[PDB]
Curated annotation (Swiss-Prot):
S-(2-succinyl)cysteine PTM positions: C28, C186
Effect the entry attributes to changing F2 to A/R: Constitutively active mutant; promotes activation of pyroptosis
Gene responsible for this protein: GSDMD
Species the sequence originates in: Homo sapiens
Residues the record marks as site: Cleavage: L9, R10
Residues of the whole record sequence present: 282 to 480 of 484
UniProt name for this protein: Gasdermin-D, C-terminal
Amino acid sequence: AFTEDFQGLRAEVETISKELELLDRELCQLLLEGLEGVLRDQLALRALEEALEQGQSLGPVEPLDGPAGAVLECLVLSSGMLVPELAIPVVYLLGALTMLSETQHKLLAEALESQTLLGPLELVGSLLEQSAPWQERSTMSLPPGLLGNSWGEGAPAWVLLDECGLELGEDTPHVCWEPQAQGRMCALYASLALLSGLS
């Protein structure tokens, strides 16, 4: 099949997330503080994406200024040589972030700062799981409010999902699945799951 299901998406993400749990906690905290600043600055988001390339630079990586440099410091040794253990997962994250809007990046920044990644991660993951098959439009039964999320026009979870192309409503049905939202909803899930794995 062309597509994957949420099970396959989850499996794919977990190949990266599984070994983030063995990463040193002090690293992940510094990395998460750096990623917060990167998610708040589109330019640093692009600067970091270029510096890492895709992790295949044979030589040392030159240090950078600002948030991009803050993240980059966490991924290199004393020489500036990237540690694939740390760089590749960040590359995967940056790849998924390319599909999201700056509005979503800053919403993810707020989630990092307040350490509230599990909420949106479950809402996005549950919508992906209950929207099968993704190529079909479908009104959905899940009310995000009954998961403990603030739900309403302008709410973080609203804007986060509205930016993916979903058709949102104040009342039932709160969410209608749109096939065009597949890629951004999947990338959104991956970005949340990778960030959460670091937390």
